[PDB]
Amino acid sequence: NPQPVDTSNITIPEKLEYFINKYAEHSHDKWSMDKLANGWIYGEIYSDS
Secondary structure: OOOOOOOOOOOOOOOOOOHHHHHHHHHHHHHHHHHHHHOOOOOOOOOOO
């Protein structure tokens, strides 16, 4: 079943006010903690090296 459900003309209702923002903040904090454990720190100028 390559295409079980078609959502080409399905509109998401605007019932999101706070929970989506909380989930996004939690995901961003988790990603930042992972990158800090990897050895990255916050700064002003991006530098890969």
